[PDB]
């Protein structure tokens, strides 16, 4: 199991608190720490960041859109 096939692609991320993101996945490590670019709030469609680092503890789901 690996997030390799998702690199540089757009993804949906569901956080553990049920919050939702849309972003380009650029980096990831073994603990699921993500490096993201052009992040948005799925529900809100509100631009969050041009670049952001997201802890794996926070992630519940990553989907390939």
């Amino acid at each position: 199991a690996t997030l390799k096939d998702y690199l540089n692609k757009r993804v949906v991320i569901i956080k553990v608190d049920g919050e939702c993101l849309i972003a380009s996945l650029n980096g990831f490590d073994k603990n699921t720490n993500l490096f993201i670019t052009n992040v948005f709030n799925r529900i809100s469609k509100e631009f969050i960041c041009k670049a952001q680092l997201l802890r794996g503890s926070e992630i519940a789901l990553v989907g390939l859109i």
């Binding site: 980096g27 990831f28 952001q52 997201l54």
Partner: protein, 77 residues
């Protein structure tokens, strides 16, 4: 590239940390380790994103971070 490598080379930049309690920490990164523990200088911490304490240095455990907003400058820097 890996999140940690990215952090290790953002040393000297400005960045904004969201913690698991909601507190926001704006500061300039001065050190990272392999568990993503940080130390930042020129710090301003907020009780929440709504916003204000200024601190000289802060140490943050990595297990407590939800996410870290990086400066758009990041990719080239």
């Amino acid at each position: 590239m890996l999140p940690l490598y990215l952090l290790t080379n953002a040393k000297g930049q400005q960045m904004q940390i969201e913690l698991k309690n909601g507190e926001i920490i704006q500061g300039i990164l001065t050190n990272v380790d392999n568990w993503m523990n940080l130390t930042l200088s020129n710090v301003t911490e907020y009780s929440e994103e709504s916003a204000a304490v200024k601190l000289n240095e802060i140490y943050i455990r990595g297990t407590f971070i939800k996410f870290i907003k990086l400066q758009d400058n990041i990719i080239d820097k």
